[PDB]
Structure 1
Amino acid sequence: FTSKDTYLSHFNPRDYLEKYYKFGSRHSAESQILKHLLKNLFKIFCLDGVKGDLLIDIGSGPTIYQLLSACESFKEIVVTDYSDQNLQELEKWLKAAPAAFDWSPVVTYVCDLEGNRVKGPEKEEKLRQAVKQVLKCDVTQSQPLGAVPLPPADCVLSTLCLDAACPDLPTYCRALRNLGSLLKPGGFLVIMDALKSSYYMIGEQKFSSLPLGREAVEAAVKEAGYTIEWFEVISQSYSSTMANNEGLFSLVARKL
């Protein structure tokens, strides 16, 4: 199983962004999943009462799409990944560097969903002001953020991170409990991940994935001390050359 250090030395942020998040008009599997991720988040953060002062995004990678709806609903976002190369790609964008990945076709899509109340430039600006800290995280540690002191969070969001970081169910469950330690009682956990997936590809590089179904996922969440508010399974897969998943899931849970 892909160890922590394989992420340090072989996860190329740029390549990853190119292969999954380019969001072209050709209706490929990777674009379809992205559309569904965005609609989920929109529905979670805008249409439901999922709001508060602080959101901690766990395993952001070099991607910022997952925070476009969330910035409307949280005054402060803290982003975290285990890999500095990913935090640097993400900082390129937060500092609006001309060499940052083009997110604009994704930014326009999220503006659409919310009835174009805001223009692109203002959607982007709002997110940049929401992101207060960019931190090293490690879901396997019982203090995932290590030394860094944060107040209790209103929400923890993790997208396609947990299947990647955890080699087994004990580890997956402990991670969820580890993540729980950053949460207010009654606070929100939001996860979306691949179903029954044992690998994903970035260019030439293969990356291990923990293949779990809806039953294991849900049981691991409940066991970790969460109460499941809702849970959704979708059939849509990645391209067969890219991952071997049967689908994806979303859940919103509350801490006890």
Structure 2
Amino acid sequence: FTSKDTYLSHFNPRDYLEKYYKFGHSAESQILKHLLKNLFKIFCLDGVKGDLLIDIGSGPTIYQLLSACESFKEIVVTDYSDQNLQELEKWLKAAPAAFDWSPVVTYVCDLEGNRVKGPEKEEKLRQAVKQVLKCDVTQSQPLGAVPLPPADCVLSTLCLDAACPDLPTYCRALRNLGSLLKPGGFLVIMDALKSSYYMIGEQKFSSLPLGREAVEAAVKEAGYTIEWFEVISQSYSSTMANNEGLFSLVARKL
């Protein structure tokens, strides 16, 4: 299985964004649309809200925070890769080399009923993100020495399957994310099903191939109660990954 040090050195953030999030009718854009609709449902319709949301394994992406910034005063973004956090920071600071998220932002504005336009939505997200932190989900203290208040919600999109080499580590990671959550707080996970790798160009990265039953069992083992669980059949392009759909779940910490 891919060593975690490979993420520091070989995960190219700009290449990842170009391959998966350009949003130019690709499998990658169909998956992105589905993820955005579910995140809108959770944070805007279901009213998952609070003072603090921690996004775990954010990579260099912000799409997973666009609806969340309407419901949370503060968002903390985290990743194992320092290069990924620097790419995020380019967008947060509105630096010239920042990735163009405007088609994704417009799509979320449309989903939300065109209450606001792209620039207002972006400013709301930029104001919500106060901290950009290193994290390691495999550790009992994922945020290391950095203290944070217990969060109202922990979100993790397409991270846990890449971070966990086996099922015991995956259950342990759910427990470690739980240490960041307030009692009764929400856990929101979205990831690929039955995927054993993903590609960024010629660079291969391992993935833990879990089925829906093993994911649900691990969340219950780790001390959560599931509110809803959805499986989609849509898979990534054959050149990208070997998954059999994706899942999304919302649970509460016991």
TM-score (norm 1): 0.99
Q: Per the alignment, in what secondary structure is the counterpart of residue 86 of structure 1? A: helix
Q: Which of residues 209, 215, 221 is equivalent to 1:217?
A: 215
* Runs (4+) off by over 2 Å: none
Kindly provide the CA deviation profile for residues 106-125 of structure 1, in whole angstroms up to 9, marking residues without a partner as x.
00000000111011000000
Unaligned runs of 5+ in 2: none
1:9 CA drift (Å): 1.1
The CA distance in 2 between the partners of 1:3 and 1:196, in whole Å, is 20
The CA distance in 1 between the partners of 2:146 and 2:186, in whole Å, is 21
Question: For residues 1-256 of structure 1, what are the structure 2 equivalents within 5 Å?
Answer: 1-24=1-24, 27-256=25-254
The CA distance in 1 between the partners of 2:3 and 2:38, in whole Å, is 30
Q: Per the alignment, in what secondary structure is the counterpart of residue 152 of structure 2? A: strand
Kindly provide the CA deviation profile for residues 57-94 of structure 1, in whole angstroms up to 9, marking residues without a partner as x.
00000000000000000000000000000000000000
Instruction: Report the number of matched residues.
Output: 254
Q: Per the alignment, in what secondary structure is the counterpart of residue 222 of structure 1? A: helix
The CA distance in 1 between the partners of 2:13 and 2:96, in whole Å, is 16
The CA distance in 1 between the partners of 2:195 and 2:187, in whole Å, is 22
The CA distance in 2 between the partners of 1:93 and 1:219, in whole Å, is 37
1:20 CA drift (Å): 0.4
The CA distance in 2 between the partners of 1:50 and 1:228, in whole Å, is 14
The CA distance in 2 between the partners of 1:150 and 1:28, in whole Å, is 39
Kindly provide the CA deviation profile for residues 113-140 of structure 1, in whole angstroms up to 9, marking residues without a partner as x.
0111011000000000000100000000
The CA distance in 2 between the partners of 1:3 and 1:216, in whole Å, is 23
1:40 CA drift (Å): 0.4
TM-score (norm 2): 0.99
The CA distance in 1 between the partners of 2:153 and 2:130, in whole Å, is 15
1:49 CA drift (Å): 2.2
1:240 CA drift (Å): 0.4
The CA distance in 1 between the partners of 2:240 and 2:16, in whole Å, is 11
The CA distance in 2 between the partners of 1:150 and 1:10, in whole Å, is 29
The CA distance in 1 between the partners of 2:117 and 2:237, in whole Å, is 32
Kindly provide the CA deviation profile for residues 179-229 of structure 1, in whole angstroms up to 9, marking residues without a partner as x.
000111110000000000000000110010000000000000000000000
The CA distance in 1 between the partners of 2:171 and 2:136, in whole Å, is 14
1:242 CA drift (Å): 0.4
1:98 CA drift (Å): 1.6
Aligned identity (percent) is: 100
The CA distance in 1 between the partners of 2:131 and 2:8, in whole Å, is 20
The CA distance in 2 between the partners of 1:97 and 1:144, in whole Å, is 29
Unaligned runs of 5+ in 1: none
Q: Per the alignment, in what secondary structure is the counterpart of residue 37 of structure 1? A: helix
The CA distance in 1 between the partners of 2:139 and 2:116, in whole Å, is 39
The CA distance in 1 between the partners of 2:180 and 2:27, in whole Å, is 34
The CA distance in 1 between the partners of 2:201 and 2:93, in whole Å, is 27
